[PDB]
Amino acid sequence: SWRAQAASRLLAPLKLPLVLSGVLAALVTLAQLAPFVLLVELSRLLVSGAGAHRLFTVGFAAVGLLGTGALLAAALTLWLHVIDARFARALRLRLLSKLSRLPLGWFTSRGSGSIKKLVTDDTLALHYLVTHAVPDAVAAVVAPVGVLVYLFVVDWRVALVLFGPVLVYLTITSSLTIQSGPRIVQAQRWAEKMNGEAGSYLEGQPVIRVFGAASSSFRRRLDEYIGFLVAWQRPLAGKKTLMDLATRPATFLWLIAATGTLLVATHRMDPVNLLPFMFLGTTFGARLLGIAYGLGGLRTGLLAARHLQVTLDETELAVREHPREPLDGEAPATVVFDHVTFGYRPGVPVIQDVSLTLRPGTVTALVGPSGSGKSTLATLLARFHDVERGAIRVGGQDIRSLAADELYTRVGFVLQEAQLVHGTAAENIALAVPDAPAEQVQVAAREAQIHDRVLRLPDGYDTVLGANSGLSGGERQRLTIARAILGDTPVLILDEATAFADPESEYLVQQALNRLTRDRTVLVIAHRLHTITRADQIVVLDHGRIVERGTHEELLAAGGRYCRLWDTGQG
């Protein structure tokens, strides 16, 4: 059962540690019920005449129990932290070296909160599972089990009566858990519908303040939710009160008293044996309903342990194939897609047998409708994912047989997602060559039209860029374009949407790109097909494969899909 599962493979080194922890936390919770066993021996000593010296030997035992139950708990709470700090430290060093090996496109399939939700929240849920949820789930089971065994050896006749309020409660609770078959998934669909509603209501605040009647939808979806909750709960109240009156200690006390009065008064009980039940038996319903509450604390720890183990299991980029043959014709810049096929999900292909061929020192544009597969086809060259069926090769060598440093020392890309690193503004312009004399860092920032904007910084080039720096997306982009100018990769992957993603700084980005895309092999993800009309080879494609191919002057002659995207208004 507990095998070969995600949470079972992650939390594998903590087997003997957690076993010792459970053994030690069983004694800790057994040394807290032992005082009530000493109370029954103190009572017997009062009943049986003598004392005043034998009654100190019970107080000695009680203070010894206090001391040894404090020592045991203090030892457990530090074992459970020494043994958890080591696991967390060794698990962070695994996440750090898994991120460095995952395919790069993975990081785009996620967001920025989906990474924190796994690196911080899922590593804190494990810390809490180890330090709280496991020692609590052991006590929550050992306490009622020990009480029930101690009360049956004392007297089995009165310990049977304590099952009345348990059968009465379990009958009801099931009669109630099937009256909410629908409404326990209805209320889960409502809880995720009312979250998107809150998100939209918060995101559309400005509109709601200009047009007042735009919040009517939210305010009527909310009266439906807080009306559903009432119509769901208001029925099942005379059941939740009934099953609550059956676990109250005032209910167990009456049963114990009525059953003990019958046995003592008829001379078959020896009333010193009814005292264990008066001490430990009245709070016996709380323990049985705390069992489930203690076992339900492991769920939010095991979910985290599974979410971490699926990520640590994610298939990472292939190691590299045999450093095979450069296929006899391709110059160091020539790029060849050869029958590539690729799809994100294992049954839905997004690319079908595309076989284009770039050339050394030429431009090549990728036109097509939206969601056509041109962004995917572009980022397939940077090995954001691996191709399923075909094979790409830049320079004559399959990009699968290239080291991660030799690939990016030969293929560069300027997409969206600026991604400045934390550090000096000259530490970003010279990231791909960290020892640039700072004269090249200047001649390269004067070409990306970002030199006068960085001289207007507090320290100038030595300014430490951060989350808030005072740089718009169009001048954070001329930095990564300056960096890319120092890289000098002879093959560029240009996303043409980076030009017009910031309209103010849109003529300076175009002067930076005029310099970045010189004397090299460019591949443009075109969006506006009037910029790419002097490209050497334009390539059309519709939801997958390639349909038409050629220059613009010719491609305009043989009418279809290109004349149909061209004459569509603009012309």
Binding site: L99, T131, R209, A213, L253
Partner: protein, 576 residues
């Protein structure tokens, strides 16, 4: 200071609930005090004399049943009303909270306060309020009934309520102060890994990924981990109440066992008091059990106080007397800032927009233009301002006249979950289906709905809805054109690829016959040849204004922008 308080429907149906939850505790105290004559009789030589005291215990148990049943049936209806009255307060407060409050964290907080407070507001009075306030008064009422019986053990039990409650408050303060250091150290550890994953493409593409991994790795490997400080944090919060409760029992049972040896009590009734001392200590343990249930509730319902104590904007009386004509918008020494560390700054802006004129606002990115529009709309208040429209300061108007003056086309278009024709009718829900006929033939969305499967009644909230970002900015133009306020504030969308959304705003300006006073923050070039005066704004200050015949012949800050915008449109990626 609203936190989670009760409704405003009644006051005699809320004070007779405390007098019921308090009698439900008197019943349990009487049920426990009735154990003294019963157990004192069971341990005597005539144990059949304990039937009289089981009769009275039955009488005291069947009464506690009724009192606990009514107190729960009422506590459920009081949870229903708390849910109803609280969810209608957050939703009534949010449209008045100041817009700069909605940061990235406050938006998450406020969306949790709406989406994730449902079931723990109904299950509050019956799950946390009565079980907690009953278990706190129970030992104090038990101690009071003992004074006629044994005053020594009664006084020793009054003395123990403050100590045992202090040991419960202190062991929770310790357990809470350590759990914050625990998730602060974890964050201080895993924020270099969060950065290493954020800037990943930049590293691998720069061939700098393995040295950065080495850096984060060695720092992580050492970090000293600061653990045993948190051990010292954690231990007292685990041991304090357990030690206190185990120590109170020893004292109370050695007091009872001593009053015997001397002769105060006899043994039978010294045991009846040891049985009562144990029952007196169970409420304290029950309070210790719903400590996590109280901390989770406190956290979850702190998000509601976060909203109900958020700063609200204040509006005057106003009554926009004669809005009719067309308003002459005027800024006067206006200066604005969300705060002063970083953000769109503005200071010294002062113009006067003649009534019934189209006015463009161009400039560097520096979006103190999306702020100049918000200051006119009323969405933001100036810090040294008096924005005044048609002569009268905006901040001196009640916020149903302060919004009945400006129609706005935002930058990022927002549509709520609903049909296409109810997003447009959100502007004027009483439009006479000809105002709807030409709010859509102006916005160029008549074709968009006469080319759509069911067209008009398409649900367009968020499903993808077949509507792209550029044609979702043609329904905002149709909404804004419907509402007939005498000010139109357009904030052009960065969206290219349009080929229709351009002519949309062009026709909105040049075609509409409603005769309002229009103000556009333009990025395109065709929507600037319709304005009759331009405002070039740099560094939060109008550097020049005028028509495009004197700006162009001024050869200054705007002729350069003109030239650049003309050259940034005939750009083409080339090999050469």
């Amino acid at each position: 200071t609203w936190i989670a308080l009760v409704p405003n429907d009644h006051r005699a149906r809320l004070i007779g609930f405390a007098l019921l939850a308090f009698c439900s505790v008197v019943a349990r105290a009487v049920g426990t005090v009735l154990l003294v004559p019963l157990m004192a009789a069971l341990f005597g030589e005539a144990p059949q004399r304990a039937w009289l005291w089981l009769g009275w215990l039955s009488a005291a148990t069947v009464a506690g049943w009724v009192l606990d049943a009514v107190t729960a049936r009422i506590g459920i209806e009081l949870g229903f009303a708390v849910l109803n009255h609280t969810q209608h307060d957050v939703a009534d407060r949010l449209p008045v909270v100041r817009l700069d409050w909605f940061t990235a964290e406050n938006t998450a907080t406020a969306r949790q306060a709406i989406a994730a407070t449902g079931p723990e507001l109904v299950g509050l009075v019956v799950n946390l309020v009565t079980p907690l306030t009953s278990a706190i008064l129970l030992p104090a009422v038990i101690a009071l009934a003992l004074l006629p019986i044994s005053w020594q053990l009664g006084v020793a039990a009054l003395a123990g309520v403050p100590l045992l409650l202090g040991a419960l408050w202190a062991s929770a303060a310790f357990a809470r102060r350590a759990d914050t250091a625990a998730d602060k150290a974890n964050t201080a550890l895993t924020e270099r890994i969060i950065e290493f994953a954020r800037t990943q493409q930049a590293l691998r593409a720069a061939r700098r990924v393995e040295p950065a991994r080495s850096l984060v790795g060695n720092a992580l490997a050492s970090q000293h981990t600061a653990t045993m400080r948190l051990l010292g944090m954690q231990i007292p919060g685990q041991l304090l109440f357990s030690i206190a409760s185990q120590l109170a029992l020893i004292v109370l049972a050695g007091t009872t066992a001593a009053l015997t040896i001397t002769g105060t009590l006899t043994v039978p009734e010294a045991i009846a008091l040891i049985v009562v001392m144990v029952r007196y200590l169970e409420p304290f343990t029950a309070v210790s059990e719903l400590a996590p249930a109280l901390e989770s509730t406190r956290a979850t319902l702190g998000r509601i106080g976060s909203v109900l104590t958020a700063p609200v904007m204040v509006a005057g009386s106003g009554t926009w007397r004669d809005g009719a004509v067309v308003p002459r918008i005027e800024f006067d020494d206006v200066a604005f800032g969300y705060d002063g560390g970083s953000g769109p700054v503005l200071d010294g802006v002062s113009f006067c927009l003649q009534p019934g004129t189209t006015t463009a606002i161009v400039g560097p990115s520096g979006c103190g233009k999306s702020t100049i529009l918000a200051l006119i709309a009323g969405l933001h208040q100036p810090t040294r301002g008096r924005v005044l429209i048609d002569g009268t300061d905006v901040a001196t108007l009640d916020a149903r006249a302060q919004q009945a003056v400006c129609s706005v086309v935002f930058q990022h278009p927002y549509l709520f979950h609903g049909t296409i024709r109810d997003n447009v009718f959100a502007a004027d829900p009483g439009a006479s289906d000809d105002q709807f006929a030409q709010a859509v033939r102006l916005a160029r969305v008549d074709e968009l709905i006469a080319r759509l499967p069911d067209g008009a009644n398409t649900i367009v909230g968020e499903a993808g809805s077949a509507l792209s970002g550029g044609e979702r900015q043609r329904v905002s133009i149709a909404r804004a054109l419907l509402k007939a306020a005498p000010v139109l504030l357009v904030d052009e969308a960065t969206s290219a690829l349009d080929a229709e959304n351009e002519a949309a705003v062009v026709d909105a300006l040049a075609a509409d016959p409603r005769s309002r006073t229009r103000v556009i923050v333009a990025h395109r070039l065709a929507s600037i040849r319709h304005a009759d005066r331009v405002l070039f704004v740099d560094d939060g200050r109008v550097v020049e204004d005028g028509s495009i015949s004197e700006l162009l012949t001024a050869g200054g800050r705007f002729s350069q922008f003109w030239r650049q915008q003309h050259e940034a449109a005939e750009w083409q990626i080339l090999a050469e």
